[PDB]
Structures are given as C-alpha cells and as structure tokens.
Amino acid sequence: VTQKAREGTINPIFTCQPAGAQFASIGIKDCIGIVHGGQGCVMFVRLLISQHMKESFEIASSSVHEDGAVFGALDRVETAVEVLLTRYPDVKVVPIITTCSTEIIGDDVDGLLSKLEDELLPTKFPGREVHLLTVHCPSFVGSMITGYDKAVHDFVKKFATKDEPSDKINLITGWVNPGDVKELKHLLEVMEVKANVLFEVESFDSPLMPDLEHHSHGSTTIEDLRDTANAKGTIALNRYEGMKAADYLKKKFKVPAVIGPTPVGIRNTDAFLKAVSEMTGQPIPAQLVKERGLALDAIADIGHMFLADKRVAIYANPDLAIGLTEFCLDLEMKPKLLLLGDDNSGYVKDPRVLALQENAPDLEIVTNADFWDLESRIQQGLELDLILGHSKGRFISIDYKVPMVRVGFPTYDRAGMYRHPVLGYGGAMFLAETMANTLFADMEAKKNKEWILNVW
Amino acid sequence: VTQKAREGTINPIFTCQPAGAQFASIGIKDCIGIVHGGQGCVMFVRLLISQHMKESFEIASSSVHEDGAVFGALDRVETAVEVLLTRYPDVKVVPIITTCSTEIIGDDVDGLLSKLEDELLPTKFPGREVHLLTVHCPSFVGSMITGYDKAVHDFVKKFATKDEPSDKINLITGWVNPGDVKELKHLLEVMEVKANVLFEVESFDSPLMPDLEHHSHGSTTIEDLRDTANAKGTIALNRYEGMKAADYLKKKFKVPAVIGPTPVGIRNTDAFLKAVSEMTGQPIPAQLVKERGLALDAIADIGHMFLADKRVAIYANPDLAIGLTEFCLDLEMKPKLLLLGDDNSGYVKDPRVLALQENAPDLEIVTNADFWDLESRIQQGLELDLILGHSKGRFISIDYKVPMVRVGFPTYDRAGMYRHPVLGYGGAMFLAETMANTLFADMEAKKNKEWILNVW
Amino acid sequence: PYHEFEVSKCIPERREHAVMKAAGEDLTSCLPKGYLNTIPGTISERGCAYCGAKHVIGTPMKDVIHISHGPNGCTYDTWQTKRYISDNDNFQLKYTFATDVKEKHVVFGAEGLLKKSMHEAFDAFPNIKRMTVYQTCTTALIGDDVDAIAKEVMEERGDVDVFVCNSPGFAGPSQSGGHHKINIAWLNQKVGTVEPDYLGEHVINYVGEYNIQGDQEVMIDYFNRMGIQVLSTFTGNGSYDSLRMMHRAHLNVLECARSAEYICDELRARYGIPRLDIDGFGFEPLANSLRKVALFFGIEDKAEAIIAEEYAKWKPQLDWYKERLKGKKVCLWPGGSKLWHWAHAIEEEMGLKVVSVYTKFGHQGDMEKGVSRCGEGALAIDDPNELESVEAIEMLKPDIIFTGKRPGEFVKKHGVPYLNAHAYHNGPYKGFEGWVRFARDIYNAIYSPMRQLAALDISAPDAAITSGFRTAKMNADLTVSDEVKFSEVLHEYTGKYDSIAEIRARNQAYAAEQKALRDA
Numbered sequence A, B: 001v002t003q004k005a006r007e008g009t010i011n012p013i014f015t016c017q018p019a020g021a022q023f024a025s026i027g028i029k030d031c032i033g034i035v036h037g038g039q040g041c042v043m044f045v046r047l048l049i050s051q052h053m054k055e056s057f058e059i060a061s062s063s064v065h066e067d068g069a070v071f072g073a074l075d076r077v078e079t080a081v082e083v084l085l086t087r088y089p090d091v092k093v094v095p096i097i098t099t100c101s102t103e104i105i106g107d108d109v110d111g112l113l114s115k116l117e118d119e120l121l122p123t124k125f126p127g128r129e130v131h132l133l134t135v136h137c138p139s140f141v142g143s144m145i146t147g148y149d150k151a152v153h154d155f156v157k158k159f160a161t162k163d164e165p166s167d168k169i170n171l172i173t174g175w176v177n178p179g180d181v182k183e184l185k186h187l188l189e190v191m192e193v194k195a196n197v198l199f200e201v202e203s204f205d206s207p208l209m210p211d212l213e214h215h216s217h218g219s220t221t222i223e224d225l226r227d228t229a230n231a232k233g234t235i236a237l238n239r240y241e242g243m244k245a246a247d248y249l250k251k252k253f254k255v256p257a258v259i260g261p262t263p264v265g266i267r268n269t270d271a272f273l274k275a276v277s278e279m280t281g282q283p284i285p286a287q288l289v290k291e292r293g294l295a296l297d298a299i300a301d302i303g304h305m306f307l308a309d310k311r312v313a314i315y316a317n318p319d320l321a322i323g324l325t326e327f328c329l330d331l332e333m334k335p336k337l338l339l340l341g342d343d344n345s346g347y348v349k350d351p352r353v354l355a356l357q358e359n360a361p362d363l364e365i366v367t368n369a370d371f372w373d374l375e376s377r378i379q380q381g382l383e384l385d386l387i388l389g390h391s392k393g394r395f396i397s398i399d400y401k402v403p404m405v406r407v408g409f410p411t412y413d414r415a416g417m418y419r420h421p422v423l424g425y426g427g428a429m430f431l432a433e434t435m436a437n438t439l440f441a442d443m444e445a446k447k448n449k450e451w452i453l454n455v456w
Numbered sequence C: 001p002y003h004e005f006e007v008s009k010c011i012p013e014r015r016e017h018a019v020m021k022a023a024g025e026d027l028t029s030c031l032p033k034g035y036l037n038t039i040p041g042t043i044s045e046r047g048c049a050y051c052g053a054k055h056v057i058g059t060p061m062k063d064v065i066h067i068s069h070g071p072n073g074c075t076y077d078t079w080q081t082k083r084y085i086s087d088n089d090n091f092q093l094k095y096t097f098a099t100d101v102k103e104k105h106v107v108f109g110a111e112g113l114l115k116k117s118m119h120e121a122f123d124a125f126p127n128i129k130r131m132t133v134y135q136t137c138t139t140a141l142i143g144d145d146v147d148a149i150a151k152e153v154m155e156e157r158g159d160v161d162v163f164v165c166n167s168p169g170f171a172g173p174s175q176s177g178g179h180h181k182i183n184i185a186w187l188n189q190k191v192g193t194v195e196p197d198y199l200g201e202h203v204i205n206y207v208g209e210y211n212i213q214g215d216q217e218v219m220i221d222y223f224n225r226m227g228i229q230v231l232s233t234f235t236g237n238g239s240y241d242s243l244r245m246m247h248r249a250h251l252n253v254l255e256c257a258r259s260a261e262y263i264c265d266e267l268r269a270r271y272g273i274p275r276l277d278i279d280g281f282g283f284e285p286l287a288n289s290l291r292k293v294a295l296f297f298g299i300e301d302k303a304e305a306i307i308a309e310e311y312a313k314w315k316p317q318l319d320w321y322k323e324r325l326k327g328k329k330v331c332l333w334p335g336g337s338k339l340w341h342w343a344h345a346i347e348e349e350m351g352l353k354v355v356s357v358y359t360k361f362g363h364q365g366d367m368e369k370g371v372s373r374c375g376e377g378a379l380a381i382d383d384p385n386e387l388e389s390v391e392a393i394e395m396l397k398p399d400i401i402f403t404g405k406r407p408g409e410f411v412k413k414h415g416v417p418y419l420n421a422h423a424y425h426n427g428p429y430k431g432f433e434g435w436v437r438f439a440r441d442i443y444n445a446i447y448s449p450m451r452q453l454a455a456l457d458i459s460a461p462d463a464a465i466t467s468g469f470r471t472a473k474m475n476a477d478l479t480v481s482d483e484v485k486f487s488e489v490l491h492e493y494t495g496k497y498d499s500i501a502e503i504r505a506r507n508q509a510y511a512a513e514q515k516a517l518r519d520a
Ligand code: CLF
Pocket: B016, B017, B018, B037, B038, B039, B040, B041, B042, B044, B099, B100, B101, B139
C-alpha cells in the first residue's frame, strides 16, 4: 500500500468532517442541524448536497463572525436554537455540528446543551419535544467519512433506549443513495425481515405534485433511533460509516453487531443475505435465487467478452470503493489503482484490503490520496480503460479520454444517478451494464473496434 | 409529408412480414412456429431476436429447397408439423408462417391444416391438444410491422371464444420490450385492473439458475387468447401493431376497442390511464399521481436547461416513433426528421401525424424511409444534436458524431436496453434522463461547454 | 414602507431589512439595512469572507496556483461550483490546492507545511509561475504568518510571484468582507510592480467582470471592434501579470461595483485614473455604455457602428420573445450587482414585471440602486432567509424566479420555475446576443408544456387529461395578437449552443493581428 508522499492536496477527493455530519443529519425526519461556525461551512454543504440530489435541504448556521471568534460564540448557538425553534415549529431534533473554527477556540457546546434544556426549552417552548445533541467535527481530523460515522454514533447514542425486545434488526446502511436504500429494503422485504434502517433516504427524491407542496426530507424517526437498543442485531454495511454506532449498541445494550460486507456485486450480496439469515433465522427464499440469476445472466452476456482484462481505476467512499474493486476482480477486470482519499489508519488493517494485496497482482492502493495521484500516474504512463468514481474527478476523465462510471457521492454531472442501486443484485446488474455501456460508447467515440458491437 | 423518391433501398429500417409474425409467435406459451420457406427466412430472424434479447427462441422451418419450389412444398409443411410435434411434446400452438417464396407459388397451407387436423393429429397424436393456424406473410407487402399486426389478429381469431363475461380488459401492447410490459402491468396493478395482456414477454428475460435450466419463452397462454372474447374492452396501444386484432374483437364479439395512444411520455401516459379508467370504472389513484410527480421532477431538472432546442431525428416502430416525437415536442426539443420506414398508407391519415404537421414547424416526416434518408440529409447539411433509433442506424451516429439513444427493436449495441421501459411514467423518466446523459457524454467527448455540468 | 414578514415577527431586527416601494417616497424616505451581521439560525443565504475573496474574485485568474492554507474541506467545497472560464484551458477550474492542515499542524504550527505545499504545487505545475495563498478559518486563528512564507518561497525559487489573501471565512458578515479584503490586498502588494510592454492609444482596465460562461469574452469582442486596448481584466479570464499593470490605464471601466469598487476608487485616488460605471446587460444599457467608453477616447463613431450592426442582427429576435413575455412576473434574487443591473432593463426590453428583488450580501448602495430602478410595489429584501422567500412567493405569485441553484430547487417544489441568476443557464447573458439568449431561457422556462402537465391532477374525477403534444410556442401564442403571431420580422433566436466559440475565435484572431503589426 502506498501512502501519498506529498503533504499538500492537489484536487481533494473528500470534504471535511462537518459535511459528513450534515449529510447524516438530513436523513432524519424533523431534524434541522445547526452548523456552529462560519456561514460557508453550511452553505457550501447545502450546495454540494444540492448538486448530488438536485434538491434543497434545510440546514442552519450559527453565523460566527470576527467578534464571535475572538470573544466566544456560544451566544450565537443559543440564539440559533431559539430562532430555529420559533420559526420551524415541526422540528424535533437539532444536532449542533461544530466546525474547525469553533473546535480550535474550544467552544463548550456540550455544557451549553445542559443550560438550554434547563432554561430555554422549558421556558419559551413549554411542552414541546425538542432533543438537542452535539456532533464534534474538527475538520483538521479525518474527512466527511469520519464525520458521517461519528454523527451516526452520536444520533444512536442520544436516542437508543432499552425497552421491550423487538424482532427487528438494525440496518445501518452507510452513506448510500436513495436507490441503494430501495434495493436493500426490497431484499429485506423478500426475506420478510423488519429493520430499523439508518437512514431512510428514499424521500430525498420528492415528487413534483399538482397541489400539495412536498419537500425533500429524511424518513428515519426518533422512534427508529430509540428502538435501535431493542433489536436482535445490527448489520452495519460500511466499516468506516457506521461501525462506531454498531459498536456502541453492542457495548451498551448487548446488541450483536455484524460489520460488513458492503453488498457490492453478486458475491458480497450473498454474504450480506447470509448475515441477515443468521441474525434473524429467516431462510433465503427462491425469489432471491431468481433475482440473483437474472443479474448473473446479464453479467454473463458481457463478462468475458467485454469486461475481462479491462484496466480500472477506482475511487469512492472507502467501503464502496473497496467493494467495487472486489466486484471488478470477480468480473475478471484488472483494477490498477484504488484511491482511498483520507488518512484513516484502518485501511491497512482491513481484511478486505489485505486480501486485495494478496490476490490482486497489478493493483496499487493509495491511502490519503487526492486526484493528483490518479492524474499524475496517467501522465507517467498508467493506461486505463475505465474509471469508477464520483463527479469531482470528471476532468481527468474528460482530458485524458478515459471513460468514467459515476458512483458514490457526489455524482452531479449525470442525471438521476442517485435513483439507481449499486448494492444488491439489482445494483450488480446496473453496475455491470453501465460499465459495458460506458465502454461501448467509448469504442464508438474513438472508433475502437466499434464494428464488434453487433453479434456479441 | 415526404415520400421517399428513390425506389430501391439503401440501408433498410425494418425487415419483412414473416419476421414480425415470428416475433409475435414467440410471445405465446407453448408455441413454436414453422416458417414455411427457405431456411434463411427463419435462421436470420432467430439471430435477430437473439441480437435484441441475447436469448435463444425456438422457431422451426419447413426447409424449402429447389425441388420444393418447382414442385409443391406442402409435403414439407406436413413433415415439419409431424417432426416438431413428435420431438417437442409440450407444444400446443403451431402457427404456419408463409414467406415470399411460398406466397408466390401459391402453396395452399390453409387447406393443408384441415387435412392435418382430420388425419395426422387424430392418428399419430391421439388426445393431444394441438392448435394449428396459418399466418400469410408475403414479404413483398408491408413490413415486419404489418406482419406482427396480422399475426396478432390471426392468433386472436384462432382462439377467442365467447363464454361467461369477464371483468378483464384486453391490453394488446404492440411490439414492446419486456421492460415496457413490466411498466404497463405495474400501472394496471396500481389501478387494480385485470387484463389479458398480449403478449406477456417478461419471461423473455430468463434467469441463469443454479440447478434447473429455464429457457426464454413467452407467457401468454391459450386461455388468455380464448378469453379475449369476454373482456369489457380492448385497449390496443399501437395502431399499426394490434388494431386489426382489436377491430376483429369488436366486429365479432362486440368488445369495444380503444386504439391508442402509445403511452410514451407524461401526457400520453395520462391519456392511456384515462382510457383504462373509462373502460373499467376504476379511478386513477393517488399513488400514480406520486409516480407521475417523480417523473416530472426528474424532467424539470433537465428540461429547459439541456433538452430545450435540441435537434432530434427519430426512427423506430411507427407508433413508438410518433409517440417519441410528441414526447420530444413536450420536452421543448426540435424534432427535425421523423422516419417511418415502410409503405403503410395510414400514416398520412394518422391524427397524430396530422397534428405534428400542424404544430411541429421544422419537422420533416419521411414515409417509406430508409437510413439513407437520414444519412444523405446530414450530408446535405441537416444538423442534429441527438438521434432516437434502434441499433441498425448506429454507423450514422458513429460516423457523423451524432449521439443516439437506443429505442425500439433491435437495440443490440447496448447492454440490457430491453429491461428498461419507454412506456409509462417510469419510461418517461428513463427516456428523458437517458437523453440527457447521452448529451452529457457527447459534450464531454467533444469538449462542448463540458464545464457546464456542475451546477445545473 | 418597511415590510415585516409574518415568519419574522419573533426576530424584530428583520423588519428594517425589507421595503415596499410606495408612491410619494424617494431614497431618503426608507431604505433596507445592509452589510450587518447575520441572525443565527435563520437559514439565511449568506456565505463567508473566504468565499468572497477566493471563490468569487481570486479563482477567476487563469495562470495562477490558487492554494488555500487550511484543511481540505474549504478547498473541496469551492471546487467545481463556478462557471468562470478562461482561454488558459480552464486551468483555474480543473486544479485546486490545499495545504491539508491536520491536528499536529494546528497545535504546532502549519508554516512548514505551507512552504512544502507551495513547493510541491510549483513542482507539479512547472509552467505556472504565479500563486495566491488564501487564509481559511483554521490558519487565520492560529496566527500562521503566510506573508513571511511567501517571501521565503519567492526567494528560494527566484522566478515565481506570490500574492497573499488574508480573508478567513469568519472575517466579515458575508462574501462582502472578502471583496474588500482582496481588492485592497492586490492594490497594496501587486499594482505598480509590472510595466506594460505595449500601451496603445486607448487603454482601459475592465474591472469587476468574472467571465461567467464567457461574459468577459463577449465584452472584449466589442472593445476590439472599437480599437480599445483592454490592459487588464479584474479578474475574469485575467492573467496575474496584467493585473499588476493596472496603474497604466487611461480609464477604469467598472462593471460590478459591489465587488471591485474599492480598487477602482483607490486607483482613482492614487493614479488619477477615472472611474466609469457601465452596464453589460440589456440592449439600451449596453449601447449607452459602449457609447460612453468610445466617447471618452473620441472614437464615438466606432461604437455607433457596433450598435447599429448588433441591433439589426438581434433586435428582431429579442422582440419575438418580448411580445410573448409581456406582463409575466419575476422575482430577481441574485447575491449582488445583478439585481440592479437587470431590474430596469428586463422590464423595458422583455416586458416582464419585477415584483421583488433581494441581495444576500449587498450594502445599502446596492439597495439604493435596486430600489431606484424598480417599480412601485416591488419588494426589496436584504439578507433573506428561506422562510421569508416562501412568504414572498405566496404573496407575489411570480411566473419565474432568478436565483441560485439550491434556492431554485427549493422554489421548484413550490411550483415556480427558475433561471440561475449566478451561473446562468444557457449563457453568457451579457451582450446583445446574450440578452436574446436570456430571453429565450425565460420563455422556455415559463411556457414549458411540462409545467402545465405538472399542474394537472390526474386523480381528479374530471381531469383535463389530453393526448398528443403541446409546444412552448403553442402556449405563448395564446397570449399574443394576430399581428404579432404572423409577423414577418420577428423570429426566434438563431444562435449556436456555444456562442462563445466563435467570439473567442475572433478575439484570438484580433490578438494575433495586433501582435503582428506591433512586432513590425
Ligand atoms: S431463404 Fe434466403 S433469407 Fe429467406 S427470402 Fe430466401 S433468399 Fe431470403 Fe427474404 S424477403 Fe423475408 S427474409 Fe425470407 S420472407 Fe423473403
């Protein structure tokens, strides 16, 4: 594994921790977060979520200015909570996300919560159900991935409450698209398994209705989060985006936790379903065999004809990127470069990465990568047929004429990618066919044996 | 409207009538057709269906040779029926499809059916349920569209039988993909409407199973076809692919027939649902309003930003092509060329076409077109941003650098296009987004304001 | 009178940030406040001072490494969100730089990391010899001395030049703090440090233009045709070294006075360079602006020739859309100058009725400009929040809204179409051709057949379900007369999807020709 030798960043792959906490927060029903810090820290993240989803989500700011930084800005947070609660009477959850600036100056937002709950909520909102929490997100640590992981842990720790036992499991999806959640919920529904899904982000896709306006929102409720303590078990798909919350549930309420695999491709979907079957006692039914068979038939049409020996560079959220690498290897492609864009120390200990090093021979893994890793390797002579990654690496694809399949977050340069799964059997079929069609369009653009697309 | 001035064909858009009858036949459960004529007439059609579906379907030949042409070849058909029935014990429907050669020499296949049912079936297959019919398909008349239309009429006329009345309607889909049928069946199921669907082609997409092999087949049964006579009404989506069967049902059994519209795009899907609602008495429910709203939200993201004023050439099956033209006009694009690839005289009297002539100003409609119509118009200076059409026009797209969205039949140069709808609200969202993504990939390949794909 | 919103009664400070124009009032009667601190928790639209400095003014420069001293997040958040293009192969859009400050650098100092990051960036891009270092929140609090590091790096390389922008996000109420900071910094550090190679007979500085979708290239084309040398452009499609030569221009042609008036006022005060405020948008404002510039140099006849030619080419097409757009209501919701650049021209030349304007960051000067150029009854808001915007829409019922992407996606879910006031839709919107492109965008958004389809409830018992198609022209022709509908002089927009390719391929030809003659 190669750690990036440069210390500065040229073209970052991820953004900072507060952005991840904000993205986790928008997945909860009746939740508006307050980002404690500068206005850019919230406005850019709302724009970035808007680029991915083409929808607007409500996140607030405490609006720290020069006097706030010099003199302390806890009064800004107190004002922000009051203004937000008076003007939005439907809000029940207010997470207070710190940024780099207020993490440096040491604003004690935890202690402020106690004062607010003892003074402001009982006085000016008597009888109203308001839950306040803090998510500490110093942007000079980690990345948006670690920010998301920490926020999920913080939401679960705030709400999970022991009660009567439930037959449900906890499914912590990780940072996934609305299309991914639909696929996972479909799998669980065929298997006849009830779950507390963290998070229900299908309602991110909101309809354009004739009369009743209907805005984009999350659908995970406080009741879902409260009931996490009473589940039969927790399956966290992403080790870097939800293992902290699952570890908390195991340690505090003795809820057994199964971490991974990310169900990318046929084989990892099987492993995910087997974990669900072990946790719940529910057999894998014949309908899933058929849906798996359909995905495999599509893959067989293109596999050793078009995907075998294709050279691929992959970057995404870490779990998705690693799972995509494994799926590409199963499809007989040749992954050449895997970019893991932050400083997490668990990558080199990850059993999935250790297996990749053992049996993926011509694959280079760069940890703490940026896009200059990919681009400067191409300039030095790395030859690729395909890239899997999100939209901020689009100019590498455009300028060096390597086609790219848009996966992960954010994918803003293609229409409706958030509505398609990359997880499950449906996602595997979608992924493999999108790779083939991306390659087909490239052969036609370059006139590269383009006559061969007739009797395959 | 322009009729093609040349008399010969350069690069035909459709194939001949027998191919259409063969495609209609593979949609019936336990049906293997015998193409009466030369072996090429069946082998090429099996290959063509294979190109579209990447699956193999059983169609037989009577294998007419030189002595079969000079002398009679009805003995070949008698032998073919016996051989096919002995070696395939599960077959119940055997349509005899004639070709150009046996239509020219006047082989009396209708009279042969009477002899076969009086002598061969009672004697060598006693008690076996075998239905034989003829489909007369002289390839020097019409095209594969007229062949399909005639075969649907012939299947319905063979089987439809008056019985106890049924609450079902008849849905004659026309020549559509398995993805199209799934969408239409979804719409009917939300509306709570039972239908005799002609044809059930979702099982064209067969799974790759672990143990028990399962081949591609059609799922419309003899019982479905028998019950067509007892329906509340018939909705034929395509005027050129199913209006004859619907007219027969009205004339013979007084089953009211509603012809069209082809539910391509938002507006025509509404009209189709209103026809279903009028026929059945069933209201349009709120779930369909939501699914329609979702499709409209996707369209609104791309419409006046990327689709408005795009110049489009369209060819497909006639009904789909006309409906695609109407959808493109609703999307604010500028259709420039519509190619209707056969000699049907109903196009110029088609009310949809008359409306296009009235309010689509810069649109040229070519009837009896071939691909040289499109290509020679580009060589003379027609400028296009997009093409909608099937795969046999791919070299126009490749050589003149006009992107193409693969619609209709056959689409063999892209993976899995048969699994996506172009009908209904789901099809409208899929169509509009595929057109946007085709345009996006083209801007990136040509570096044509490709920086603009960031904050749309 | 001061407009108080139902949603803002609990925050009474908001009352004096909105006015409604009333007959019998002038600028001295009432005026919304501006350039104040933001009320926390309002979900306002405001950004940070780093945005105003780096994202808005700094990055447009095309031959510069723009490196932010801070963690990756600030750099990522402003990357690939803007549409200022350049003829340097869009270097400023494709490459972005951070020092990637970590916790060890916060605790122990990040100046060694900054120096090493600067050397790495110069090493990776050896054809780039210019650099700007931007402060973020993190490195501005801890007291990193960027200026000393820039001095050290310059002397170690010997062939690079570094500009320092100390504009952290918290240092100001909005992007406006950033505008002011970067203007004064560039003036004090960089202006006067390079001499022009050639000075023509009529030299201008084009100030306050950021080349959104080629807006600057459109304006350079006009100036070339009048024989006017644009010494430098601040800063769209601008080169570092030309901007160091600003002290040698005969005239400052100021487009956006919200972001660049500081450097213009100081160049006027120091070097005696006159300041000429112009409009780039509209037919009549753009014509008058060209007339003034040509008049200053005594070359008026050249401007008149451009104007006649452009009117003959584009006025018939603009009037086609103007006839179909009369009486339609619009909310004008940019951040800054585009509210007063557009409010009067859009009403006069497209027939639209401007029912509301707002600014995110503009001072009281922008509001006095905007209130002056708007009609009576228009709603003028300063530092709007999301709930105020919803209330305004429910009160004013606009047919289209000009706003940002994310605000546009919000108002979409309330029935209204939007055009991107910031990044444009099918831009550039400057020029005579650009105004026609703007009118077509407005007409396409308003008269979309999809918009009427979305308004239709198909589950209603007697729903007006139809089949076939409709076009925007069918919808818009329902509003015009027979004389307009069958006019033989009005026709739709006849322009390419990329109008800048031909304009840019003309500015470059001119440059080549001028070089040839000069070198001879
Ligand atoms: S055995 Fe061979 S392919 Fe067959 S016809 Fe004969 S030469 Fe030709 Fe032709 S037009 Fe269609 S495909 Fe046939 S029915 Fe006639």
